[PDB]
Design a protein around this ligand. Structure first.
Ligand SMILES: Nc1ncnc2c1ncn2[C@@H]1O[C@H](COP(=O)(O)OP(=O)(O)NP(=O)(O)O)[C@@H](O)[C@H]1O
Ligand SMILES: Nc1ncnc2c1ncn2[C@@H]1O[C@H](COP(=O)(O)OP(=O)(O)NP(=O)(O)O)[C@@H](O)[C@H]1O
Ligand SMILES: Nc1ncnc2c1ncn2[C@@H]1O[C@H](COP(=O)(O)OP(=O)(O)NP(=O)(O)O)[C@@H](O)[C@H]1O
Ligand SMILES: Nc1ncnc2c1ncn2[C@@H]1O[C@H](COP(=O)(O)OP(=O)(O)NP(=O)(O)O)[C@@H](O)[C@H]1O
Ligand SMILES: [Mg+2]
Ligand SMILES: [Mg+2]
Ligand SMILES: [Mg+2]
Ligand SMILES: [Mg+2]
Lengths: 761, 332, 232
């Protein structure tokens, strides 16, 4: 089996599907099909055909024959590619045009920017010389290019007869009647689509199967005897993808789309907001199938505790009544968008309303890369821009932030060219304008000068850490496999033996021994999402979103199953219940303790969700967290031993320029009782010393050359500046253990007597 | 490399750029260019020229010749310096005036404070004695000084024909028709500019590249394939520079500027605040390129938790809708 | 006349140089590596495949010149310097609330390169009380936890260094010493015989001192005196 969630997105290869390719002819009403492809299509040489494009756009052209066109090719020209909205490499479908429909009229009008420089009737110069007796097929809404000399005027197919498409026979009596098709109309063409949304595939698949399927193929649901949900609610960080995704789905499904912007509704006088809502719903019902996208729904339907006026609760109630009135099932779907899912009134998040919710969260590396590719598809990038590096460096960047980053890169490119650009002149040199290209350094500078927005939001992603990055801890990994991986990859195994596992683990040990890394590594092994939460972050949550922060992170973990919810730095929240119970500063630790235990109680029934903790202070850890049904498994992470420290050094220096004479194993003997953090700080000090050394070396070399320029560039060239043993010796000189010999036997004692904390002392 | 952030502010020295200098003559419609500078400019002795000043202010004068004028000098008189808004040491540019445009009428009116003590028709005492057959170039909106005895009356070029600038030929039939050009009109002249803002260069450069470039040279952004940001938000300690900088940039970029003061919007009855906002945005769109400076925006768009009434959230929502409606990119 | 914007955070390059600071040669030498090199030469660390640390803590006797070192290192790198004191942070919560620490950190982000200095950690960084409780210290707990949260998100900004200073290292919260936070620990000692001469000279670098005054003579007699005492 496989994960069939992302199955609707898959394109089903068919004999009628041909890949896009360049044509041997620039004819706009004629393409060229390979003879074999035509035979599969039952077509013949020079036969009109309908090409199915993207965004519900299609054109009509006569297919020729040529053996150079490989089987998975169609050989269309640039104009057809633009009309279909398909770039090279897309997979269009081909259908026949048996009804050639020799048209009596083919209304043709020009575009203003393609007419600049025409001093004669366009009908007698462009249209008639190429259409009369040519029998060129024409598809309404497609821009065919024409030439009548030096100027090239492109006309849109305004109004054919038949209306859809026809063939331009000699009987087509028509001329150019005015210029009403100015180029600015392109703002509503090629606007949005599936290809314009990147970084979301699971959410996009969910939206498509909840919106497009009920509206295009309701027969499936009717036969299965299930009524599909009518309420969808997109939510996520501001600027992520919501309004784009809604419009993309609406345009791709080809259903009547009505946008109800919250500010627009609330900016009108009382009695017009409700009137507009009623009109929108009525029009959607009349023109079914339909979609009603309510952007910024939080403004028109905020939490009832926050809304003050009566003409706001009235609008909320009107919206609720209208949604309740949609149970007629007139192929109408109401989709929402709100960055504040909790700010929404609870009534909306109910059956018969917005009951199905999709979280358009922060994208991962591949998503950011795809977003950047989408946004830079039009910019004049140079041949040395590496978007992979930028995507790796852009952590916490939503799509809007990436678009702003591209814009800032372009601006920085302009600033570099400001020296050769004079602002006083009302016009800029054309050659200078066309020679501006965005380089990688511009992007790096823009990224340095740009800041992320969704850097505080919880991130649900598979960590990149593997077992290799962690040195030693073989037994800990061996037991973690049983505790986590087996009940996830093989859940039925436990049911086979009639015994359920435990969904809780606690890591206790000296600081810097690799407790945070183990959680990420085990998540990576099981390919399960990882949610990182720190005690300091939890403590500020109560002074803020309040009760709905811990509940929210746990709900997110539930929605993201399988998951590994890690609570680092339990030393603060899990502080043992004070004997003199009191205070509000610790009244937040008591909250993040009791409310957290309450959620732990309800989490054992979810399955495939494991709650892992980490504490450097097992003495103060609340004994309640150790209860069965909670973090009861206790795993001790010891200080690395002689063998483990070699692995730790190697991992810390797995990508370092270390010299050939450095004995990694030698340091292990001298560094005993040092945590992994100290072992990494040793390497950091060594790297800093090497940087100092090679900085001084390069400075001395350049100063030697400048102290008599006649001195030529000798064979001496900048070297690796590898980390010599001297640097490591100097680092070990200042290196100091972060765990004392008196603070290890105590950890051993707690390893012995930790779970006994639920009783007396 | 260098920090190219403060690059737009830099003035690009050009052969047409001359530094300001005192003139050997007090003539207001005549300056004096060094012969070599004229040769670089392809000008000749006694040729009308357009001088590009600051704050979108320029004058027209006939350039003479003199060897005492160093190459980086223009030798303009005090009146020309005042009209151009340029003090000594500024770097103006020089353009030719091939269309001398001998004008049929040169409307001239006086200023009240320069007329105190005149007991005769100003046309027969100041204008005609110095304009008839003098062929003095005149630029609309420039105050040229004249004398008809002891009193010195300075007149503004009210309405020339052609409207922009012309040469005062003998055929210029005109007299002083009233005194509608009282000196108090100077409150709206030489008001604000880049030189009137000090202590901010990085912020000023950012504002200029985010506002003036998209409005004057959108070709760069269009070719690069990037849509420039339309929303800018100045913030800082009260009284620092905000309202001054906004007006300075608006006047220097020479685009239709509309000021929407928050208190003024909120001081009106319900249904007039939103009406005024809509009118402002519509007028800005009509007269593109344009700028819509919303001072004290916090009053009309405060935090929703703090606002209590409905006719305030309505204004906030109207503003949000109007800004969302600006994606048409009409150079606004 | 009185100023108005005297309470607002100021983002400017300090005028203090290494000369105004007497002695501390080793401290300056290590601060160069810790701060200047990852700023002037950021690509150097990427060349060796190892990232630096954006945190430092100054602990030592009062009056030994911990505040001056931060300003001096900012001046050397020509980076903006933001000065924040624990007493100021404690009143922020009783006020702008959550959006004061977030705001100063955002300002530091916008002003990169920057050196965000937290003087007087003796108050905010008071060690988490065993009997956790109270709202007077519920502000120290806020300025501690909320500050650590911001420190966590600051390591990805680059060219922003967070420096602390504490005269009470005993009570300093152990969380601030974590990697990814103020983990580098630099000890500022009491000036020695040689350092005190430099301190006197700096304090009197623009003074009318007579021709018979032996600056070095005082150094011997003043032992154990902090720089503040030498200036007094
Ligand atoms: N996944 C994406 N792929 C491509 N472009 C994107 C993507 N996400 C965002 N963008 C771009 O960024 C813009 C901002 O996203 P938008 O769709 O307005 O977000 P939003 O969630 O509706 N914002 P708000 O209502 O202010 O919280 C889009 O209009 C695109 O130009
Ligand atoms: N076993 C290990 N192998 C390799 N590197 C390690 C190991 N243990 C610690 N380190 C390094 O030291 C850093 C700190 O350890 P970490 O994994 O964060 O432990 P922790 O228990 O979260 N520490 P703390 O929060 O300070 O109590 C890691 O991110 C690694 O860089
Ligand atoms: N940088 C500057 N250069 C010259 N004059 C200045 C400068 N900044 C302020 N001024 C003067 O001080 C006045 C007050 O500044 P103003 O532009 O009104 O500040 P503001 O930020 O708009 N005030 P508020 O809206 O009350 O917070 C200006 O009108 C000038 O007269
Ligand atoms: N090394 C030094 N060289 C010169 N002057 C010094 C030195 N150390 C201290 N001083 C002087 O003493 C003053 C106080 O020292 P400062 O640099 O503020 O230390 P601090 O650690 O901030 N003190 P405190 O906040 O009282 O614990 C300085 O501003 C100087 O005037
Ligand atoms: Mg939206
Ligand atoms: Mg931990
Ligand atoms: Mg103001
Ligand atoms: Mg201090």
């Amino acid at each position: 089996k496989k994960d069939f969630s992302t199955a609707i997105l898959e394109r089903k290869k068919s004999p009628n599907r041909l890949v896009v390719d360049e044509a041997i002819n620039d004819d706009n009403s004629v393409v060229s099909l390979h003879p074999a492809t035509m035979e599969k299509l039952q077509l013949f040489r020079g036969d009109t055909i309908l090409i199915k494009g993207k965004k519900r756009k299609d054109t009509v052209c006569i297919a020729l024959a040529d053996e150079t066109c490989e089987e998975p090719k169609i050989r269309m020209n640039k104009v057809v590619r633009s009309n279909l909205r398909v770039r090279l490499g897309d997979v269009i479908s081909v259908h026949q045009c048996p009804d050639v429909k020799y048209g009596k009229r083919v209304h043709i009008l020009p575009v203003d920017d393609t007419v600049e420089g025409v001093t004669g009737n366009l009908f007698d110069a462009y249209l008639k010389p190429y259409f009369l007796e040519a029998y060129r097929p024409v598809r309404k809404g497609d821009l065919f290019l024409v030439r009548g000399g030096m100027r090239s005027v492109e006309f849109k197919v305004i109004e054919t007869d038949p209306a859809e498409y026809c063939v331009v026979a000699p009987d087509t009596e028509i001329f150019c009647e005015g210029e009403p098709v100015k180029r600015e109309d392109e703002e509503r063409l090629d606007d949005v689509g599936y290809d314009d949304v990147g970084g979301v595939r699971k959410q996009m698949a969910q939206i498509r199967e909840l919106v497009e399927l009920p509206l295009r193929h309701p027969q499936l649901f009717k036969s299965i005897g299930v009524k599909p949900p009518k309420g969808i609610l997109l939510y996520g960080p501001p600027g992520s993808g919501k309004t784009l995704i809604a419009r993309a789905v609406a345009n791709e499904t080809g259903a009547f789309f009505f946008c109800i912007n919250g500010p627009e509704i609330m900016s009108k006088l009382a009695g017009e907001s409700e009137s507009n809502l009623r009109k929108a719903f009525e029009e959607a019902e009349k023109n079914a199938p339909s979609i009603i996208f309510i952007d910024e729904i939080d403004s028109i339907a905020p939490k009832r505790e926050k809304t003050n006026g009566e003409v706001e609760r009235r609008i909320v109630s009107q919206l609720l009544t209208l949604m309740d009135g949609l149970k007629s099932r007139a192929h109408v779907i109401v989709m929402g968008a709100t960055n504040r899912p909790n700010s929404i009134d609870p009534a909306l998040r109910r059956f018969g309303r917005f009951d199905r919710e999709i979280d358009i969260g922060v994208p991962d590396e591949i998503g950011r890369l795809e977003v950047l590719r989408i946004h830079t598809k039009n910019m004049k990038l140079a041949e040395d821009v590496d978007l992979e590096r930028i995507s790796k460096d852009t952590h916490g960047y939503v799509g809007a932030d990436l678009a702003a980053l591209c814009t800032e890169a372009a601006l920085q490119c302009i600033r570099e060219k400001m020296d050769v650009i004079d602002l006083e002149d009302d016009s800029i040199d054309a050659e200078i304008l066309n020679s501006m290209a965005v380089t990688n350094e511009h992007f790096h500078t823009a990224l340095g000068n740009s800041n992320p927005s969704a850097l505080r939001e919880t991130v649900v992603e598979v960590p990149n850490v593997s077992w290799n990055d962690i040195g030693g801890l073989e037994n800990v990994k061996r037991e973690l496999q049983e505790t986590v991986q087996y009940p996830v990859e093989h859940p039925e195994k436990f049911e086979k033996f009639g015994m359920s596992p435990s969904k809780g683990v606690l890591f206790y040990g000296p600081p810097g021994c690799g407790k945070t890394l183990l959680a990420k590594a085990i998540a990576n092994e099981c390919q399960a999402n990882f949610i990182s939460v720190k005690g300091p972050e939890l403590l500020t949550m109560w002074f803020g979103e309040s009760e709905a922060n811990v509940r929210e992170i746990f709900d997110k973990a539930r929605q993201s199953a399988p998951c590994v919810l890690f609570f680092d730095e339990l030393d603060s929240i899990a502080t043992q219940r004070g004997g003199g119970s009191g205070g509000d500063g610790g009244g937040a630790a008591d909250r993040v303790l009791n409310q957290l235990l309450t959620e732990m109680d309800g989490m054992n029934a979810k399955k495939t969700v494991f709650i892992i903790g980490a504490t450097n202070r097992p003495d103060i850890i609340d004994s309640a967290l150790l209860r069965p049904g909670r973090l009861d498994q206790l795993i001790y992470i010891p200080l690395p031993d002689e063998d483990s420290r070699l692995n730790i050094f190697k991992a810390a220096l797995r990508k370092s320029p270390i010299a050939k004479d450095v004995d990694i194993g030698a340091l292990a003997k001298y560094t005993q009782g040092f945590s992994g953090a100290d072992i990494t700080e040793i390497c950091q000090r060594a790297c800093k010393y090497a940087i100092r050394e090679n900085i001084e070396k390069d400075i001395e070399k350049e100063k030697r050359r400048s102290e008599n320029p006649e001195a030529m560039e000798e064979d001496g060239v900048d070297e690796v500046s590898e980390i010599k043993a001297a640097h490591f010796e100097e680092s070990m000189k200042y290196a100091r253990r972060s765990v004392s010999d008196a603070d290890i036997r105590k950890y051993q004692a707690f390893a012995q007597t930790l779970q006994q904390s639920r009783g007396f002392g």
